[PDB]
Amino acid sequence: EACEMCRLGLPHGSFFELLRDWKKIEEFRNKS
């Protein structure tokens, strides 16, 4: 119960940021 993001069920942490970054690169290479 320390983590308010976990309490609200919202996505966060390393695996989430990896996902977003991974998606950014895919986006960039399909357009390009």
């Binding site: 976990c6 950014k24 960039f28 290479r29």
Partner: protein, 225 residues
């Protein structure tokens, strides 16, 4: 709670099997969908929100993000964007920290350690530089994020980073001339080679000394006889 823990650990084991390469990871068409689905599953998994990410994920990310190659060239595959590249440097730092930590706890050990350190500093600086080049060619310059980037990732190189901040005040032609000339002198292919060697050197160290499997059996076999 514990069941989705188990499911997320299994998705992570499947990712391990797709990401760990003898050479460098790249996204193949026939794996796009399952790799994307595994990454999205882990990204929303409640049990993974505060788990330490295994080092193979960071390595795969770095290989993918910088489009690393050993043997072979592709036109502009690297997304030079502040937030992405800052997160990439963070993940490279994590690889280095893991490698340093595991190397603390046969006769080639000191050499492999020292070679990784040199390669890390050079890779880090090269990524910094090329991100800075990108900033310098934007019009107008994003001075807040540009200064922020250099503070965070140009503390060791404080001598070079004074010049870029002065250069950012000059007009676009001058900045373009500078970047043009500095790219011809030290092109990206040099840093592709440095990163590739950092990553491959690290994988070998971690395999031989620190009990990982990074599919380097053939390099270890050659290092025997």
């Amino acid at each position: 709670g514990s069941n989705e823990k188990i499911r997320s650990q299994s998705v992570l084991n499947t990712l391990e099997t797709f990401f760990i390469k003898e050479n460098h990871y790249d996204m193949q068409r026939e794996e796009s969908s399952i790799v994307n689905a595994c990454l999205r599953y882990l990204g929303y998994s409640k049990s993974m929100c505060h788990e330490k990410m295994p080092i193979f994920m960071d390595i795969a990310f770095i290989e993918y993000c910088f489009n690393l190659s050993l043997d072979p060239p592709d036109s502009q595959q690297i997304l030079w964007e502040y937030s992405l590249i800052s997160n990439a440097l963070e993940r490279l730092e994590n690889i280095e920290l893991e490698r340093q930590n595991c190397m603390r706890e046969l006769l080639n050990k000191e050499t492999l350690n020292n070679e990784a350190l040199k390669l890390y500093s050079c890779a880090k600086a090269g990524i910094c530089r090329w991100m800075a080049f990108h900033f310098l060619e934007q019009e107008p310059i994003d001075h807040i994020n540009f200064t922020k980037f250099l503070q965070d990732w140009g503390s060791h190189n404080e001598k070079e980073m004074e010049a870029l901040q002065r250069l950012s005040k000059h007009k676009i032609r001058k900045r373009l001339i500078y970047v043009s000339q500095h790219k011809k002198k030290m092109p990206w292919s040099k840093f592709n080679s440095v990163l590739s060697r950092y990553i491959q050197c690290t994988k070998l160290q971690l395999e031989v000394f620190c009990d990982y499997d990074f599919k380097q059996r053939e390099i270890v076999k050659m290092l025997t006889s």
